[PDB]
């Protein structure tokens, strides 16, 4: 029968990626949002991954016209009526544990309210919002330190894995459905959170000054900016002003110190270019002086550049590793999937100094993994010719 | 030593009766809020009551020079500045469970944001809003209805009772304190509500709708109103409207049906007024079919006549016995203490139908309660001479 796939990001294209891999007499549709226009970002284009692998592109009106299909929605941007449809045959991931958080902005609005924890749910799309009977739902609990940038990154994966899961019980029908609770259940709209003039409320709590911190840090789209200055994480202190909520302590380059309600605050000014720059060519030791949150350590930049990607493109063998200790991922990738044992190549060809590669393979570097084009390592080292540096990689399990 | 009350409303005016009950060698001051100017109203004015009893009210300022003193603060309304003091003697009551609810209207807060919980907790004044440090707590659930009236009144009750299980200990200097935590901490404004143009967000939920309709439901102050119709409960229904959240389904004398996010709701007009002139002449079939909530039968008007008032001053005695089966107090006072069995001796006097008094006796009816004044029905009626009716009441134990 037909499977029509309408959304974006990961979860749309990883989704697609198992259904080709895994499903065989099924025939794919993509509908895309109105936003993708083929840009690979801190997520996938799912149009660019669409027209790459010949699955074909239709609006939503062809696919209500579109008979023996059934249509899965991930985080896609139009309305989507029932009544429209043959069939009932209508599926939707939410990202979050509903009934709660129906509608908008679902990785801020869980941190703004000091939730434990949050969720994804697959439910029936029916008229209305969020709206429709649960088929699964999935939780997990919110971190200390968690942001919109972290908490969504949870939501694509989790979603990923539900569909998945779900997808030959959809396809049989073999599911069972029960309507959602009026009890607990909650919406936010667009309206809620104006993304461009975000005012951080000083005359609150310490506590709830960085909540909004956090909810509101999510680099691709914005940093809290207090002051003039740019914002990644902060602490409570022990100390309490009697100022007025809101007074500036002390600025400085480093960081911003204002009275609350309760405990004084201490804001990290944002050095992930610093943080970025230092991983080329300095210690660990300097950069763990450096850094006010190790949470930088697990920053992207734009192209998705990590401090490990930066360490492994220049070579610098202390800062691999004790990013590693500190649970950096020794495979992470960019926002095109290449490597960082592809970068770490690119640096053993440069400076032709091999030396430090039996290191990173012991601690769990894989050789074997592709970029979002579907080339390894060696695709491209047979590609520029580099058969010594090719074979000298090949001897190692 | 001495124990200046800084507060207003039924919490200042009970523990003083407690410590003059109860405390002997102890030098009592008052200090009255700005906007108590001596009217009783659903609470009772403590200017009135210190002026009546002989407790001198003193200035803030004043207070500040009174050495040999304890000051304990209920529902204040000026800033107290520790600074100010000789001495760290200086206590507060707060309506919250800090350090949650920190600042303004924590009878609507908690609901708004739909807390299994809220408390009263007595702590140290410090230079800020509800920060210091804790001498004890009690918590409480909320109903399924809960509104801020009755929330209210909670705190009032458990933070009189909070006040007098640990006044000795104040007294003597032997109470243990714990810092507030900032975790979990939160405060609202005066800012956080506007209680003079007050807006229901429809686009929203139908619990969180019934939520702020409840969180805004206090008689003495307000009523939501609706679409020009003032509102006093609602209810979920199970139909769930296609058209937007907002849209008026229906509209009559009795109630509106709106179109919320998911699940549509019935929202009850006002009919309190109703209610009471039914409790003069008709029946309890009557009543059970006009009221539209039970919680109805438990409102009072701006004198602090109830249902049951109405009914006892009116003889209506089907009513009042229907009414204690409901869970209405057979004691029941307005606003001046004055009782159930007060207005039905009203009755008996008027009507010289003497007859149902032994029903209501055995029902719980308290003939030894003394009102606002200091007098019982007993006083009434030898001042007015009505000696017949005294004796007949006399009569009962
Ligand atoms: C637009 C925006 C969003 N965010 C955060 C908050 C948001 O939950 C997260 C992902 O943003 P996104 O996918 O635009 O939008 P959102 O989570 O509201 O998703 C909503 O819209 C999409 C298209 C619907 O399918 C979805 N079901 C909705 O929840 O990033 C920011 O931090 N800054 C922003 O400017
Ligand atoms: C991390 C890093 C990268 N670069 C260069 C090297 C790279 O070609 C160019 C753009 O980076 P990119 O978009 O992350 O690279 P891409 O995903 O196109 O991968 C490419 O370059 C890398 C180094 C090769 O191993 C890989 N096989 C190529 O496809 O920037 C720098 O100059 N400095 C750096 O710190
Ligand atoms: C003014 C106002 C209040 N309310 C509700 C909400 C509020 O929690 C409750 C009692 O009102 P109130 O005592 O004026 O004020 P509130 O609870 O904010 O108390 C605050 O001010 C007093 C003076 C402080 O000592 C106290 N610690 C504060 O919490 O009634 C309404 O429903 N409508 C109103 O217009
Ligand atoms: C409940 C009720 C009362 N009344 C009258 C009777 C009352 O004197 C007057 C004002 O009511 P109130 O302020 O509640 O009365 P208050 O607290 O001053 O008490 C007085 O009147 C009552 C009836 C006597 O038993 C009592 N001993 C008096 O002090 O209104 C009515 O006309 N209709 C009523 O339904
Ligand atoms: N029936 C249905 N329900 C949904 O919740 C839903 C779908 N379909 N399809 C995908 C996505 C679409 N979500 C939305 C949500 C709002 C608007 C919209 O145009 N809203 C108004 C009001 C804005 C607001 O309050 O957020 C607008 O003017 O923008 C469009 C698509 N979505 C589930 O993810
Ligand atoms: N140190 C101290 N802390 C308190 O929280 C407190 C006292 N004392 N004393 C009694 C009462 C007084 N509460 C208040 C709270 C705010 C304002 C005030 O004037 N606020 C500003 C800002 C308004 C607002 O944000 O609420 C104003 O302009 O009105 C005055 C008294 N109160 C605890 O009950
Ligand atoms: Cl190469
Ligand atoms: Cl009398
Ligand atoms: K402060
Ligand atoms: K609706
Ligand atoms: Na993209
Ligand atoms: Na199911
Ligand atoms: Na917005
Ligand atoms: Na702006
Ligand atoms: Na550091
Ligand atoms: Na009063
Ligand atoms: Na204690
Ligand atoms: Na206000
Ligand atoms: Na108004
Ligand atoms: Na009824």
Redesign the pocket.
Same mark, same amino acid.
């Given at each position: 029968m037909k499977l029509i796939i309408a959304? *974006?990001?990961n979860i749309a294209v990883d989704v697609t990626k198992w259904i080709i891999k895994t499903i065989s007499d099924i025939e794919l549709y993509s509908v895309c949002?109105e936003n993708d226009h083929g840009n690979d970002s801190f997520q996938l284009s799912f149009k660019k991954f669409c027209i790459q692998f010949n699955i074909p592109i239709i609006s939503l009106e062809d696919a209500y016209h579109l008979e023996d299909a059934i249509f899965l929605?991930?985080? &896609? !941007?139009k309305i989507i009526h029932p009544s429209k449809f043959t069939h009932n045959r209508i599926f939707?991931?939410? &990202?979050?544990y509903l009934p709660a958080y129906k509608?908008? @902005?679902?990785?801020?609005?869980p941190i703004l309210n000091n939730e434990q924890e949050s969720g994804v749910t697959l439910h029936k799309i029916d008229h209305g919002i !969020?709206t429709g009977a649960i088929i699964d739902q999935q939780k997990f609990p919110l971190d200390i330190e968690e942001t919109?940038?972290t908490?969504?990154l949870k939501?694509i994966k989790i979603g990923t894995e539900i569909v998945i899961k779900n997808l030959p019980a959809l396809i049989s029908g073999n599911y069972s459905i029960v309507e959602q609770s009026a009890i607990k259940s909650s919406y936010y709209s *667009?309206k809620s959170?104006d @993304? *461009?003039n975000?005012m951080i409320d000083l005359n609150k709590t310490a506590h709830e000054i960085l909540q909004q911190i956090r909810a +509101?840090? +999510?680099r691709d @789209?914005?940093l809290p900016r207090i002051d003039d200055i740019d914002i990644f994480h902060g602490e409570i202190l022990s100390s309490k002003s009697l100022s007025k909520p809101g007074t500036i302590l002390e600025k400085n380059n480093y960081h911003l110190i204002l009275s609350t309600i309760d405990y004084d605050i201490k804001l990290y000014s944002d050095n992930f270019d610093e943080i970025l720059t230092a991983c080329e060519d300095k210690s660990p030791e300097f950069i763990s002086k450096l850094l006010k949150t190790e949470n930088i350590l697990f920053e992207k930049n734009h192209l998705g550049w990590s401090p490990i990607i930066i360490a492994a493109y220049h070579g610098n063998m202390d800062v691999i590793e004790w990013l590693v200790s500190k649970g950096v991922n020794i495979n992470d990738r960019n926002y095109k999937g290449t490597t960082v044992a592809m970068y770490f190549k690119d640096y053993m060809l440069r400076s032709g100094n091999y030396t430090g590669l039996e290191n990173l393979i012991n601690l769990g570097l894989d050789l074997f993994l592709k970029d979002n084009e579907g080339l390894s390592v060696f695709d491209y080292m047979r590609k520029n010719k580099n058969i010594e540096l090719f074979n000298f990689m090949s001897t190692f399990n």
């Amino acid at each position: 029968m037909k499977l029509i796939i309408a959304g *974006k990001n990961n979860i749309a294209v990883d989704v697609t990626k198992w259904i080709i891999k895994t499903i065989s007499d099924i025939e794919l549709y993509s509908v895309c949002n109105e936003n993708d226009h083929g840009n690979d970002s801190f997520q996938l284009s799912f149009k660019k991954f669409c027209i790459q692998f010949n699955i074909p592109i239709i609006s939503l009106e062809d696919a209500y016209h579109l008979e023996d299909a059934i249509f899965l929605s991930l985080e &896609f !941007d139009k309305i989507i009526h029932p009544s429209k449809f043959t069939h009932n045959r209508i599926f939707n991931i939410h &990202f979050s544990y509903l009934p709660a958080y129906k509608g908008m @902005y679902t990785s801020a609005w869980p941190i703004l309210n000091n939730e434990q924890e949050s969720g994804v749910t697959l439910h029936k799309i029916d008229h209305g919002i !969020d709206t429709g009977a649960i088929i699964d739902q999935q939780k997990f609990p919110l971190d200390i330190e968690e942001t919109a940038k972290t908490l969504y990154l949870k939501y694509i994966k989790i979603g990923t894995e539900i569909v998945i899961k779900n997808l030959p019980a959809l396809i049989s029908g073999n599911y069972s459905i029960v309507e959602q609770s009026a009890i607990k259940s909650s919406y936010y709209s *667009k309206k809620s959170i104006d @993304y *461009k003039n975000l005012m951080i409320d000083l005359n609150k709590t310490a506590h709830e000054i960085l909540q909004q911190i956090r909810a +509101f840090t +999510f680099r691709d @789209y914005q940093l809290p900016r207090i002051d003039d200055i740019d914002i990644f994480h902060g602490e409570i202190l022990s100390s309490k002003s009697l100022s007025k909520p809101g007074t500036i302590l002390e600025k400085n380059n480093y960081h911003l110190i204002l009275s609350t309600i309760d405990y004084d605050i201490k804001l990290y000014s944002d050095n992930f270019d610093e943080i970025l720059t230092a991983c080329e060519d300095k210690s660990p030791e300097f950069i763990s002086k450096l850094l006010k949150t190790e949470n930088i350590l697990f920053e992207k930049n734009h192209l998705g550049w990590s401090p490990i990607i930066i360490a492994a493109y220049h070579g610098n063998m202390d800062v691999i590793e004790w990013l590693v200790s500190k649970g950096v991922n020794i495979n992470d990738r960019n926002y095109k999937g290449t490597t960082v044992a592809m970068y770490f190549k690119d640096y053993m060809l440069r400076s032709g100094n091999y030396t430090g590669l039996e290191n990173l393979i012991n601690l769990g570097l894989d050789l074997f993994l592709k970029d979002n084009e579907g080339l390894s390592v060696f695709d491209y080292m047979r590609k520029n010719k580099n058969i010594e540096l090719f074979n000298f990689m090949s001897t190692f399990n």
